[PDB]
């Protein structure tokens, strides 16, 4: 009702927004996007509360994503209207007149609710309460205050807080209330929830940010930090406070980096522009700390080292598929380094020689499915690879590709072997890729499969992605490469060489008393467990205790040492025997092993969420005796299928193997009774397991299964009889 004051609110808001702008220079040129202010803090915006009739330009609702079909565009919320207009506080804040009426209901309604609950003789519980958690002038939730029993003596408290202004040199706006007695008295969850919808939803906001560049799977599990940057106690205890003019800007580093595809716009900083001398990145105006942050990210010629990597790794496909296409040979031009950010024109990167002559389809997108019309054109085909660093205005990659293709081929600024070629385009700021140009049979789905592989596999992109992530200090909970899970298990028996690796019994330790009675701990011998599922081949490198001499204690380097042994093996093992995939039981081993195996990039490394019962197998006396009596490190080999594969299917033999070890884990000697039901049962002495017929194996398999399920029931405190055969199989295989 106080129209004079609403005008002041609009004034004050515009002033503070200008203060942010000057922190990014900008000065008089307008069209600065509103999204950076009002986006909630959890998405990395400033979280500004709005009290004016500001509106978003209709250009800012655009968003896009790439999938296997190619790119798809979206245009959030609008049917025709410009009416997206950044909610006022006032609609979401309840009038006093309603508060003073509602408090006569809820404090009476609660009183009835507990009275019947105590007549029900049970504790009032959160599901009864969430409908009226946040109501009443004394808020209902104040009854659950930590120290409520002692606050009942704090009389006079409103007088005291008003008088605090004569003692504390700060000033606080909540001089009339305190959360200890009144509760929170406002809530703006609803405000935040539809601020996002006003700006175009979560997927619409993130186009204005570098989020796509970091290549996280999804925006759910993300977390920020602000406790270990430069802003430590170092920053504040440092002498000479007048130094805070350069390093006064540096807390803003993260914010400027995060929002950079919309601060750096040509459409906003109208004026002269520059290109950062080792990159393709154009800059408009002098943003105070973006130039610093980019040079760090692309340190040590990363642009070329992305480019020439992708060139070689693409050629590696053509280095194998020689007979899949009408080509004789391919060549790598190894042309001068600076072309990777020579935007004015490009030469070809790769050259291909026909057997005779293909058909040339037509100049068309990578997504264009079909048809042919162009003349056959003998011998000469070429591809170019274009990197770029896009932003919000021009992150469309397919329009970019077709544009650059025409520009260079129509005039003499470029040399290519022939008109028959294509250029790939990759936007490193959003991880989009596409191509435009000429094609030939088979090549188009081949390039599709190749690029789809490259964008996740390539080491040089991994360097770039990790630097952006660590520079943003943005962390995630769930994302990894795909876990080994139950439904994958059939792929383990494919013709590829595959190893399991387990290290759980390396750094074992024994407590003992000293002769002085004080307690301490001794390390003992360990082993590295390595096993082949589709062949039964096992390796066992005994780690003798002496290797940790001097080190001892917490055994910190044990995981790193473990990777060294595995790498030493694989290096000396013949090339044809090398794994295609290594699967590791403990996720902590992944980073050590990866670093040591970079010389052999054919090796897939994969972590399991599905645990396996190998840990108990090393307590079998046939193995335990050997490890204890050993006095120097030495390798040992076993085949855990004694003779089974001569009649038994490998996955069924694997099933038997898993059953035995799991049973020994859960009930030990009782499983041995099933292994040894009469003392007159027999084995070869070389064998791990008794000599038995297939029927006799089937009999004990059922018995071991029934023990495992019974023990599963006992420790889950639940009936076993509801389980299906598939659920039984999953529990045996490792986890449901």
């Amino acid at each position: 009702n106080t129209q004079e004051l609403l005008d002041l609110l609009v004034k004050c808001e515009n002033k503070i927004q200008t203060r942010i702008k000057i922190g990014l220079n900008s000065k008089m040129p307008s069209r600065f996007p509103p999204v950076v202010f009002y986006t909630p803090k959890e998405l990395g915006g400033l979280g500004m509360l709005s009290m004016g009739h500001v509106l978003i330009p209709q250009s800012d609702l655009r968003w896009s994503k790439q999938t296997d079909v190619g790119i798809t565009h979206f245009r959030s919320g609008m049917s025709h209207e410009e009416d997206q207009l950044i909610p006022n506080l006032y609609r979401y804040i309840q009038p006093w007149e309603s508060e003073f009426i509602d408090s006569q209901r809820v404090w009476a309604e609660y009183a009835l609710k507990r009275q019947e609950a105590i007549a029900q003789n049970r504790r009032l519980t959160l599901e009864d309460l969430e409908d009226s958690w946040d109501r009443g002038i004394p808020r209902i939730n104040t009854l659950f205050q930590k120290d409520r029993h002692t606050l009942a003596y704090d009389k006079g408290w409103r007088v005291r807080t008003d008088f605090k202004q004569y003692q504390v040199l700060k000033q606080n706006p909540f001089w009339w209330t305190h959360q200890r007695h009144d509760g929170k008295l406002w809530n703006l969850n609803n405000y935040r929830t539809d601020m996002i919808q006003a700006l175009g939803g979560v997927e619409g906001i993130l186009e204005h940010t570098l989020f796509k560049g970091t290549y996280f799977p999804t925006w759910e599990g993300l977390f920020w930090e602000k406790a270990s940057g430069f802003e430590e106690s170092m920053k504040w205890k440092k002498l000479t406070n007048a130094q805070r003019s350069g390093l006064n800007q540096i807390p803003n580093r993260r914010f400027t980096l995060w929002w950079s595809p919309t601060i750096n716009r040509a459409n906003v900083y109208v004026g002269f522009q520059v290109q950062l001398d080792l990159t393709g990145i154009f800059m408009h105006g002098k943003i105070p700390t973006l130039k610093i942050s980019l040079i760090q990210i692309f340190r040590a010629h990363l642009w070329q080292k992305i480019h020439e990597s992708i060139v070689m790794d693409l050629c590696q496909v053509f280095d194998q598929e020689l007979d899949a296409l009408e080509i004789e040979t391919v060549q790598k031009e190894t042309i001068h380094p600076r072309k990777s950010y020579k935007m004015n024109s490009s030469c070809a990167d790769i050259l291909l020689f026909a057997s005779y002559k293909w058909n040339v389809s037509r100049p068309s997108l990578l997504a264009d499915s079909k048809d042919v019309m162009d003349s056959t054109t003998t011998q000469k085909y070429w591809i170019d690879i274009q990197l770029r660093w896009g932003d919000y205005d021009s992150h469309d990659i397919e329009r970019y590709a077709r544009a650059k293709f025409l520009d260079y081929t129509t005039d003499n600024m470029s040399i290519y072997p022939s008109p028959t070629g294509v250029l790939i385009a990759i936007d490193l700021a959003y991880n989009l890729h596409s191509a435009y140009g000429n094609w030939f049979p088979g090549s188009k789905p081949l390039i599709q499969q190749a690029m789809a592989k490259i964008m996740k596999a390539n080491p040089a992109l991994y360097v770039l992605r990790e630097r952006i992530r660590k520079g943003l200090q943005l962390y995630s909970s769930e994302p990894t490469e795909p876990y080994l899970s139950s439904q994958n298990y059939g792929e383990l028996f494919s013709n590829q060489i595959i190893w399991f690796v387990d290290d759980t019994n390396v750094y074992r330790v024994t407590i003992h008393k000293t002769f002085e009675g004080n307690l301490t701990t001794k390390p003992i011998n360990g082993a590295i467990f390595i096993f082949n599922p589709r062949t039964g081949q096992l390796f066992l490198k005994i780690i003798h205790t002496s290797v940790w001499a001097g080190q001892k204690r917490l055994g910190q380097l044990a995981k790193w040492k473990t990777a060294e042994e595995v790498a030493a093996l694989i290096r000396s093992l013949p090339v044809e025997e090398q794994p295609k995939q290594i699967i590791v039981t403990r996720k902590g081993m992944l980073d050590p092993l990866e670093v040591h195996l970079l010389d052999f990039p054919n090796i897939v490394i994969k972590g399991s969420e599905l645990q396996l019962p190998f840990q108990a197998c090393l307590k079998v006396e046939k193995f335990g005796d050997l490890i204890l009596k050993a006095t120097e490190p030495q390798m040992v080999l076993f085949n855990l299928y004694d003779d089974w594969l001569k009649t038994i299917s490998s996955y069924t033999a694997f099933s038997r193997l898993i059953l035995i070890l799991r049973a020994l884990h859960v009930n030990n000697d009782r499983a041995k009774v099933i292994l040894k039901p009469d003392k007159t049962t027999i084995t070869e002495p070389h064998h791990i397991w008794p000599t038995l017929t297939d029927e006799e194996w089937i009999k004990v398999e059922v018995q071991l299964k029934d023990l495992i399920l019974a023990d599963y029931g006992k420790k889950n405190n639940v009936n076993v009889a509801s389980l299906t055969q598939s659920e039984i199989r999953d529990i045996i295989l490792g986890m449901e």
Binding site: Q537, S572, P574, E632, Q634, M635, L637, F638, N639, H687
Partner: peptide
């Protein structure tokens, strides 16, 4: 590095893994 094949009915000793 010493290896001790115990995969079955014979025991063999390699002294480097390239012999395997």
């Amino acid at each position: 590095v010493k290896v001790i094949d115990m995969t079955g009915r014979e025991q063999k000793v390699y002294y480097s893994y390239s012999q395997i």
